[PDB]
Every structure is written in structure tokens, then in C-alpha cells.
Amino acid sequence: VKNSIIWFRKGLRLHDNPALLEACKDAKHVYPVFVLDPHFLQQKVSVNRYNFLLESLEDLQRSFQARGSRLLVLRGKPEEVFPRVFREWGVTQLCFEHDTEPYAKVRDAAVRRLAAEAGVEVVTPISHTLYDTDMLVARNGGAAPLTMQSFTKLVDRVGDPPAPAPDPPAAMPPPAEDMPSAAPAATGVPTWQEVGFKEPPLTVFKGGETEALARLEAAFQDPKWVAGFQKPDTDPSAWEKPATTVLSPYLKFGCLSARLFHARLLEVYRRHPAHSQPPVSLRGQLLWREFFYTVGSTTPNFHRMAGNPVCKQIDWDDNPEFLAAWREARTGFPWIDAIMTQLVTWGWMHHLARHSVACFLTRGDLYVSWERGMEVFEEHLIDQDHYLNAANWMWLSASAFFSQYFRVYSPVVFGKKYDPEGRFIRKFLPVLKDMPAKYIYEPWTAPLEVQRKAGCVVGRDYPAPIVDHAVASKACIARMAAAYRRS
Ligand SMILES: Cc1cc2nc3c(=O)[nH]c(=O)nc-3n(C[C@H](O)[C@H](O)[C@H](O)COP(=O)(O)OP(=O)(O)OC[C@H]3O[C@@H](n4cnc5c(N)ncnc54)[C@H](O)[C@@H]3O)c2cc1C
Numbered sequence: 001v002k003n004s005i006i007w008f009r010k011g012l013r014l015h016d017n018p019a020l021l022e023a024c025k026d027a028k029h030v031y032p033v034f035v036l037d038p039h040f041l042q043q044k045v046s047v048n049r050y051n052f053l054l055e056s057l058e059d060l061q062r063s064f065q066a067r068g069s070r071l072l073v074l075r076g077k078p079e080e081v082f083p084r085v086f087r088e089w090g091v092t093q094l095c096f097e098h099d100t101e102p103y104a105k106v107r108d109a110a111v112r113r114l115a116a117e118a119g120v121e122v123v124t125p126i127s128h129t130l131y132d133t134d135m136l137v138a139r140n141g142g143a144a145p146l147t148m149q150s151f152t153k154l155v156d157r158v159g160d161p162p163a164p165a166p167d168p169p170a171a172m173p174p175p176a177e178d179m180p181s182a183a184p185a186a187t188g189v190p191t192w193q194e195v196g197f198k199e200p201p202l203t204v205f206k207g208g209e210t211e212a213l214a215r216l217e218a219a220f221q222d223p224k225w226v227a228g229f230q231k232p233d234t235d236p237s238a239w240e241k242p243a244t245t246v247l248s249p250y251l252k253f254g255c256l257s258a259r260l261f262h263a264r265l266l267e268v269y270r271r272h273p274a275h276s277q278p279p280v281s282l283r284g285q286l287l288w289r290e291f292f293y294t295v296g297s298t299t300p301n302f303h304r305m306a307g308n309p310v311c312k313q314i315d316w317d318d319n320p321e322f323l324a325a326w327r328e329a330r331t332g333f334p335w336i337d338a339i340m341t342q343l344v345t346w347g348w349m350h351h352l353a354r355h356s357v358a359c360f361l362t363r364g365d366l367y368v369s370w371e372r373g374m375e376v377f378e379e380h381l382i383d384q385d386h387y388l389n390a391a392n393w394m395w396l397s398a399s400a401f402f403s404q405y406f407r408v409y410s411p412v413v414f415g416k417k418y419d420p421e422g423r424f425i426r427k428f429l430p431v432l433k434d435m436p437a438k439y440i441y442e443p444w445t446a447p448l449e450v451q452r453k454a455g456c457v458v459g460r461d462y463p464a465p466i467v468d469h470a471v472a473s474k475a476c477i478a479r480m481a482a483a484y485r486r487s
């Protein structure tokens, strides 16, 4: 008989799941499995993103139970767990979504070898991305494109991505009864308290495929807003209703299919001939995701500077003091400190908000390495994506893809153009709620009588600016200029 395992790593969904569809075909028993490492916190990861994963698994558990099945959260390492469940469950086929991250290829290759030793067939369909990334590289002559312009001409030469896969059947072959490794006491979804966390998550974005599909429909309630979407014109100070979709944590964990997103976009574009085009359109935003995935998966040492062929070697400063202030949101610039508070609270910020803090830390003011800023984002972001977090950090530091190091965001002026009253700042920095709008971006410039009135004294209740932007930016620009001439 056919007993199959559908291995969940990314792609935490039932829609557009070709790996799940293959595992259910002519199957007597199907074992949905997520392999959890109970020693992950005893190695880095916030409770916000880890609880987002756990919520995403609870949603899978409910979806499987509605179809007569059950999600199994096995404990341990994959190389030590699968060889046992292969013989115990009588497995003949192992299916999982293909993943191109560096750690995935080593993990998957070892699992492939273990499956071959147990006589288990392996099926690895591509569904986390729009296209077969290796196919894009081969069609381009063996090398990936290094610009969005040329990459967009490539995907237009290949055509539309594959349509989303159909939905799985309403009834699924369940796991076999009375199997010791499938016992409910050892395979349930744990809570964030049981995995070692001590403080509760504070984010407002819930995990799971059902929430992903709900937020997708919410984005498509107005087709005119979808067709006329232009990324650089959106508002980074909007928090009550974010100016963008906030689908990135669902796309990172696979809770929402990218091909489904792209299929829904084409349906709206077909009825609106004046829709925006890449790179600024919503379709272009998934193409940015596809572009960084293609270049990152084929570039050695893509998450670092040394040994990275596309990253410029800049002599960034080893300044732990500036890094600490930036990390702990006490730089003295309320626009920067509020975004860093939104990072640790929600775990998500608007794209232009991430530009402000990443430019400030690197080529703009502090001259700290983008690697150090990356390690801060990898901890707190709930959409933390390997290839995307680096390519955008290398973009903001002018180490790759981007090279206009004379464009330096002002930490005082940038947020003033969108939000003159500073409503975004009072929400996340309530110490400044009563500060008048004239000084909310420059609190150190307010008279002492005003600071005492507003209950916010600079140097006592809120810190002073760590640097003078006029002095710091002119110095970083000169250093980046000499680094570009020596390269
Ligand atoms: C320093 C820095 C770090 C970043 N790190 C991440 C990260 O770890 N994970 C992440 O998903 N994005 C990252 N981005 C891109 C950007 O922060 C988010 O993709 C976006 O702000 C999420 O909002 P949204 O889902 O509403 O995006 P939308 O505007 O709705 O875009 C739709 C989708 O396209 C993708 N996308 C959008 N912008 C980009 C981009 N610039 N590059 C690649 N894909 C993009 C995402 O999957 C997103 O969900 C980073 C950007 C910067 C400047």
C-alpha cells in the first residue's frame, strides 16, 4: 500500500500545495508532519515570530481536523526522526516543498539520502516562488540577472507563472491508528510558554493560512487601489490601516501562495488597462521578492560581506555604542526610535520606515555594518526572510544593487512630509504624546518651559540626539565616496 508523508517546513497552507496533492494521491495513510526542534531557544528568535509560526501550525491543525486528519508536530532533528518514522509508518513516498536557502539544501540532501536507504520516493515540487528559479538562470544563459530591469524582461520572456494548484480533497487519508510516534501527547502544537519564552507576544498580526486568505480578500475589496498601486508613494506613517498589504509574514512562512497572489493580480489588471507596471506595481513587489530569491540562491555568501562577489567591501565602523542606541530605540530622533519600537512590538514596518532606520544605521549617520543591522531585524521581524532581509540591507547600505550614496534620508524631515502632527510617533512613543507638533520631530529644540509642560524633558524622560545629522551625514557621504573610488 501507499503511505506518504507531507513534510511542512515552509508552505504552511492547504491551497496551492502540489506536495500535498501528490502525497494524497492513491494514498492509504497520509502523515502531515512538522519537525520542531525543542532546543531552538537554547542555542535569536523573538516570541512574536515564533508564536506566528505556532499560530500558523494551529491553523493547519484545524484544517486537517476538518478533513478527518491531524497535524503531527514531531520533536527532534529531521535526520534523526525520519529514519524511525520511515520504518514505523511503512512510508513509500516523501513530499515537501522545495527550498533554496543554504541550510535547507544541506538538510534536504541528507533527508534524500536517508529516504533512498529506506526505499522512499522523494517528490519536491516548486511552489514557494513564482517560477523555478534555476530555470530562470538557465534561460538567461547560465547567470542570474543583476538588475530589476533585466530581470523583468526575463520573466516577460518566460510568460505567466504556473497557475495555483487546486484544493486538496474534502476528505484526507488519516494517519494509521495506534502508532507510537503519532501519539497525540508528543505531536501536539505547543504554546509559546511551553517552548521557553517568558514574555508574551505583542504583535497584532495573527498567523495561519485562514488569516492570510482573509487579508488577501481585504486587499482586493477595492480593485482600483490594486491596479493603481505604486510602492514609493505609499505612507510609512500609517498604522491604523497600513498603506500596503502586510502579506509579507504570510508569504515568508508560506501561509499564502505567491502564485495565488499573482493570479489574483492578473485578474484585476485584465479589467483595468491603466494599471501600474513593474517595478512599482503590486505585481512588481512580488517580482522584487522573486528577483532577490534568484540572485541570492545562486550567489555564494549572500548574507555576508566577505566572500560575497556582489557586495562591496566597505570598512564599516565597529561602534557598539551607536549600535546599542539604535537597537534599544534611544537615538534621540523620535522618528527613528518609533520605528525601532514598532519593530520590537509589531515585528513589521512599512518599507519606507525600514529605509529610514537602515540608512540611519549604515551609510547615513552611524556608519555601522549592515550585517549588524541585519542581525537585529532577523530577531524581531515576523517576515524575516533570508534572501530579502539581506538584499534590502545591502541596498540601503549602498553595498549592492543600489549605488546613489548621495541620497541620504533626513531623520527629522522624512516623516514630517507624511505626518506633521506626529501621530505615528505618539502611538509608539507615548512619552511624547503631549509634545506640541512644532517640536515633536526635534524635541531638543523645544524651550525648557514647553518640555516641562509636555512632561517630556530631554535628557531625563527622552534621550538627546546621539549625533548631529548635518555633521554625521556629511562625514558618511565623504567616506562612502572614497570607498567607491577605491573599489
Ligand atoms: C532593510 C530592509 C529589510 C527588509 N527585510 C525584509 C524581510 O526580512 N522580509 C520581507 O518580506 N521583506 C523585507 N523587506 C522588504 C519590505 O520591508 C517588505 O517586503 C514590506 O515592507 C512588507 O510590507 P507588505 O507585505 O505590505 O508589502 P507589499 O507592498 O504589499 O509588497 C507585497 C509583497 O512583495 C514582497 N516585497 C515587497 N517589497 C519587497 C522588497 N523591497 N524586496 C522584496 N520583496 C518585497 C513581500 O513578499 C510583500 O509581502 C526589507 C526591506 C528593507 C529596506
Ligand SMILES: [Cl-]
Pocket: 408, 409, 410, 413, 414
Ligand atoms: Cl528626506
